[PDB]
Amino acid sequence: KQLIEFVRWSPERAQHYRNKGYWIDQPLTRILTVGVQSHPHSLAIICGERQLSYIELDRLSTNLATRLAEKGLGKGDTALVQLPNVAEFYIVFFALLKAGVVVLNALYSHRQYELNAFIKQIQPKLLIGSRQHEVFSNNQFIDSLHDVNLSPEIILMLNHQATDFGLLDWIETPAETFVDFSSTPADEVAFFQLSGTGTPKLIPRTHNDYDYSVRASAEICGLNSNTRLLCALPAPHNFMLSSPGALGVLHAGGCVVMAPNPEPLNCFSIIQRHQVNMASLVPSAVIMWLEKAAQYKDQIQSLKLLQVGGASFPESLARQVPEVLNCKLQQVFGMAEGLVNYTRLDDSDEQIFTTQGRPISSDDEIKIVDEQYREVPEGEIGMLATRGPYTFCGYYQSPEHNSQVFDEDNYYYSGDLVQRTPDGNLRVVGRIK
Numbered sequence: 001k002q003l004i005e006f007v008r009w010s011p012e013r014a015q016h017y018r019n020k021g022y023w024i025d026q027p028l029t030r031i032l033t034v035g036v037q038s039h040p041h042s043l044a045i046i047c048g049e050r051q052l053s054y055i056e057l058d059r060l061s062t063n064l065a066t067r068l069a070e071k072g073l074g075k076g077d078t079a080l081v082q083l084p085n086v087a088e089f090y091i092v093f094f095a096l097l098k099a100g101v102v103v104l105n106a107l108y109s110h111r112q113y114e115l116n117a118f119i120k121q122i123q124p125k126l127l128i129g130s131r132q133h134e135v136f137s138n139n140q141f142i143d144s145l146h147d148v149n150l151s152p153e154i155i156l157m158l159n160h161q162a163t164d165f166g167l168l169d170w171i172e173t174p175a176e177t178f179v180d181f182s183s184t185p186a187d188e189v190a191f192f193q194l195s196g197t198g199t200p201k202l203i204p205r206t207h208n209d210y211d212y213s214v215r216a217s218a219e220i221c222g223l224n225s226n227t228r229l230l231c232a233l234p235a236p237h238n239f240m241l242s243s244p245g246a247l248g249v250l251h252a253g254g255c256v257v258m259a260p261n262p263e264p265l266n267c268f269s270i271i272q273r274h275q276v277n278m279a280s281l282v283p284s285a286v287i288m289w290l291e292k293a294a295q296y297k298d299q300i301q302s303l304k305l306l307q308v309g310g311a312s313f314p315e316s317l318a319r320q321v322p323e324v325l326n327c328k329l330q331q332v333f334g335m336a337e338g339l340v341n342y343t344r345l346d347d348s349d350e351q352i353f354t355t356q357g358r359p360i361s362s363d364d365e366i367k368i369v370d371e372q373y374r375e376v377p378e379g380e381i382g383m384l385a386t387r388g389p390y391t392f393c394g395y396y397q398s399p400e401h402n403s404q405v406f407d408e409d410n411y412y413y414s415g416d417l418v419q420r421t422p423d424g425n426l427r428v429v430g431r432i433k
């Protein structure tokens, strides 16, 4: 009955973030609840041939939540989920939020080695995966867990075998009996994000802090009920989930449109079919798109905004976005640990093409420091340190590492090398180990 442990913000900071209206002390399910109230029949998710309305998304995740609760999974428990880019990812995410189960969403590209490390760290009582994934092709991996007393009490499979619990069965049919359930408290852990060498580290995220980042990002990117966002990056990634990502689009009442990956021809036909107007990519994928865009100009005309974040995205490449992809560019530099930066939609061309923008919050605090951790002269290159209303205060159960990446004032040192431009934005220039 003990809630998952995590490092808290100081009480003084928590109060300030409430006073400012950042933390409103609602669960992440707020997004769905409110949507169902306002526009139950608007499309929330488009996936292949399927069209899920807000109320359907709400019903289905409720069904699964009741099933999990009926089996005694709830507050204090954790879950490991590994699903590809399909509507079930969101159904499951909202079900676990509803049920009070703290969930770690593994990347679909993760393998037995990562999965094992995650299971060891969070002792999930629930595992959801897909039979089509390499790790669950056979029962080797699953059986291995019994050999080590880490077997989950419940295992659900997408593309299940006859003797499996079918994920779709637990979604489609509500439970026999009724057991009470509810989200974890808003200033407590909702789910684990993952850092992006060694296995990824677990980043506890509370409803308060995640919802804030989501609502504020949605406003910054001008999302609204007509937004149709392509989800071609991995759904669990902070960028694709919250920046502003699927949660942002749902917050704004719009629709998420799934793609398996950023392969251009498939993405282009999806964009044409559903008149997608927003997408989010990393530079290597922007380059793939640029290679075909001229020829498939007609298919992607509806794009109005493309976010680009990740690796190097030099100016000469950035300028090709409006020129070739025929949509506005927004640069994004963020981290699953918290801090996200966006170029604003009304920024100058220079800002948009040569910087990675500025923080979500007026209360995102930034230090740029030299080798002695003294703030460098304004405009010079330095190591990034940050804290704010949606930046974490430590990795899960990692006191040693935490002490090595936070300073006495609880600034987080992300290892990024950056400089502030005169205009006020940030330029990412490298990384330090």
Ligand SMILES: O=C(O)c1cc(-c2ccc(OCc3ccccc3)cc2)nc2c1cnn2Cc1ccncc1
Residues within 6 Å of the ligand: 196, 233, 234, 237, 238, 239, 243, 261, 262, 282, 285, 308, 309, 310, 311, 332, 333, 334, 335, 336, 340
């Ligand atoms: O500094 C970075 O290394 C970085 C990587 C990625 C990123 C990398 C891979 C992703 O998915 C990996 C993938 C790419 C192409 C096809 C299939 C999978 C998603 C985001 N996104 C980044 C980075 C820096 N800002 N952003 C945007 C961002 C926004 C919010 N939270 C975290 C990151």
Ligand SMILES: [Ca+2]
Residues within 6 Å of the ligand: 051, 052, 053, 056
């Ligand atoms: Ca439907």
Ligand SMILES: [Ca+2]
Residues within 6 Å of the ligand: 300, 301, 302, 303, 304, 325, 326, 327
């Ligand atoms: Ca366009």
Ligand SMILES: [Ca+2]
Residues within 6 Å of the ligand: 322, 323, 324, 325, 326
């Ligand atoms: Ca053009």
Ligand SMILES: [Ca+2]
Residues within 6 Å of the ligand: 196, 335, 414, 415, 416
């Ligand atoms: Ca980093």
